[PDB]
Design a protein around this ligand. Structure first.
Ligand SMILES: Nc1ncnc2c1ncn2[C@@H]1O[C@H](CCl)[C@@H](O)[C@H]1O
Ligand SMILES: Nc1ncnc2c1ncn2[C@@H]1O[C@H](CCl)[C@@H](O)[C@H]1O
Ligand SMILES: Nc1ncnc2c1ncn2[C@@H]1O[C@H](CCl)[C@@H](O)[C@H]1O
Ligand code: MET
Ligand code: MET
Ligand code: MET
Lengths: 266, 266, 266
């Protein structure tokens, strides 16, 4: 099945030609394809950050999409590239190192194969750039309509490496969660606390590390509901609880990092 | 009318997936469309900077263009999104907060509507991301050929919020103007002084704040007319007067900011 | 001959609209064209860096590609823009200041013309932006199928300015070379030492400036062959010798710059 829309993510940056050579390879194999960047500014080697960036990609993108993604410090070793068809019908290609975990939570694997066949690769294969020669090349082949079965042998979806993600839970108070990611352009803090856990309960937010700092925060539908510069709690596009300042940068005011505990209570 | 070329600007950056999810929504509604980024690195919340970046966009881009732009700290409140047809025939979609002001100076609004109809939106609409769910979604619908009248009710062009812009004027000497923007890649300074005001009159340039600094500058057609490192005055692509150093960075040598007065005389 | 794929490089950055106005001009002249960025974050005025970024572009990109590239501090002077057909069949447009040197090493010029004819330019031509009004505009015309002979007069390939590049040589030991570029996203160091010179000979690497620092390094096929954080020598995608740390940044650990000598011996 043709998938004329390739969505492309990596940790190689857009500041040099590296990412564009990959596209060069892709347009060569799939001249009908539209290539769109997700981002290339995933922090180096950071599989987790890459995986978070891919989470909402299945839902935002149409079914004829190939998600092409690589953050691959394991390039040129035993850790293989995989190719996947999800429940939506989209195709996904990347290293089997956890990168596709959160994309697959959004729309599970129906079929998966290890990418092993040289006919879907860019020959010769450079040991230090599987991203281009295997991931990108295979992604374009699948876009052009190559059968998923031709890429290599079938594997069970549990052979796909998954990244552990902490779930928010009820304590007495009391909801305990953590900082998942930071919306870097604005400095809004994203937690793992979903809509339904807070639905129960101005609220009290404790950020213990550091430094046992408590804030009394209003819950708003949007930023403009508090005065300029003032803090707020809101639910984001993903149904997760978030912290921000109206027209300012929250983490510059409260240097929280991913992993940090967030407790919210009446 | 089909407008297969969507030109896309925001303040969300390109360092994460946010801007690409918007494109995901757009390719879904308009699979025939070509999406090209203007830039996503408008400083956060900075409507003015966004508006300057859009100025030359009507003229540089063909008539079948939809200009899709959002810098929207007012997302999820009473400040609506608007959709506009200009005199060139282009379509423009963005928040009614001043963002489209300078694009509209270049090619005025012929027709404008508030974007209110749910059928041109991405349901459900997230209060904190009108950019994606209203601005991007509506832009794609108009690209695909949706009638502008279906987006919501007509409004008068004066109901479109405009940003004030200072005009350069003749004093005795003597031309008084100000710093509009900085060409950040190179550090060239852009003023609001047009070709015709200086046509009259090496020249003398005073930058009063700060610190009453006077420079004797040659007027050149281009950078290579003075020695490497030396300062010059020239007219830019926009017919505005500019200050630069040949193969160096002017603002790193003279820390001027937008708003600062520039006086030029014989 | 139609060349529907335009690959675009400059030093104007992607942080503002400048690069996108160029694309605006290109889609206008060539509505069938696909425009893909190589990168716009070439350091300002740095022709050499631009030229290195273009090296692998002929080989990575299909034959129907127009390579459109400008780093042009000589804009609006006697240094002309050139247009070139290479041995692969690709077309290249840029300033005659050395920028196309390394792209042309990969696939030599078969035909070259100075770009002089106003009918392949964007009128009126702004002296300070040949990038947009000549380079971009001509690139789109050639993409759309304009004959290369219509752009201006033919010239001999030796009238194309070439940048000098240092070759690695055998000494006694002993191979002497230098730092060519830094893989900035990761901090891997690229040398000019090819596969065949080291084929002869853990190895000893001396980086004399600075500060006569010697390292005993293993030669590996890829990063994961040494422990996390440890240094390695490997051959890259280009058949050049490279230095890196496994999942870390080499130049942050050893502040080498392009030009620096690298000596490798048993
Ligand atoms: N010095 C280094 N150590 C470990 N991994 C590295 C590396 N340089 C690049 N990569 C990794 O090579 C991949 C291309 Cl296949 C990129 O995604 C990047 O993660
Ligand atoms: N903490 C914050 N305060 C005010 N506005 C914010 C914000 N975070 C994002 N936006 C705004 O949300 C818009 C998407 Cl609709 C973006 O353009 C951005 O301007
Ligand atoms: N202050 C300055 N001095 C010398 N060259 C400059 C400059 N500002 C922009 N350019 C040069 O103008 C070109 C567009 Cl034609 C860009 O590629 C850039 O290299
Ligand atoms: C260091 S990863 C693979 C090397 C490739 N040449 C690149 O530019 O990233
Ligand atoms: C903070 S603005 C709207 C939120 C959206 N999730 C984003 O990535 O920007
Ligand atoms: C300074 S180079 C040519 C000027 C052009 N206006 C630009 O944005 O770069």
């Amino acid at each position: 099945m043709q998938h004329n829309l390739i969505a492309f993510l990596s940790d190689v940056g857009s500041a040099d030609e590296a990412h564009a050579l990959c596209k060069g390879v892709m347009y060569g194999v799939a001249p009908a394809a539209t290539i769109v960047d997700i981002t290339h500014d995933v922090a180096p080697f950071d599989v987790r950050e890459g995986a978070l960036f891919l989470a909402d990609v299945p839902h935002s993108f149409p079914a004829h999409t190939v998600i092409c993604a690589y953050v691959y410090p394991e390039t040129g070793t035993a850790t293989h590239t995989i190719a996947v068809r999800n429940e939506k019908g989209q195709l996904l290609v990347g290293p089997n190192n956890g990168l596709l975990s959160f994309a697959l939570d959004a729309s599970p694997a129906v079929e998966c194969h290890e990418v092993l066949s040289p006919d879907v690769m860019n020959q010769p294969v450079t040991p230090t750039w599987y991203g281009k020669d295997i991931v990108a090349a295979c992604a374009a082949h699948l876009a052009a309509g190559t059968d998923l079965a031709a890429v290599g042998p079938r594997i069970d979806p549990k052979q796909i490496v998954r990244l552990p993600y902490a779930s928010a839970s009820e304590v007495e108070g009391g909801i305990r969660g953590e900082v998942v990611r930071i919306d870097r352009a604005f400095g809004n803090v994203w937690t793992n606390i979903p809509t339904h856990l807070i639905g129960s309960m101005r609220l009290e937010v404790k950020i213990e590390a550091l430094s046992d700092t408590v804030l009394e925060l209003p819950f708003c539908k949007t930023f403009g509901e508090v005065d300029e510069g003032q803090p707020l709690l809101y639910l984001n596009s993903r149904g997760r609880l978030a912290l921000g300042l109206n027209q300012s940068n929250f983490i510059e005011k409260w240097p929280v990092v991913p992993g940090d505990s967030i407790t919210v209570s009446p």
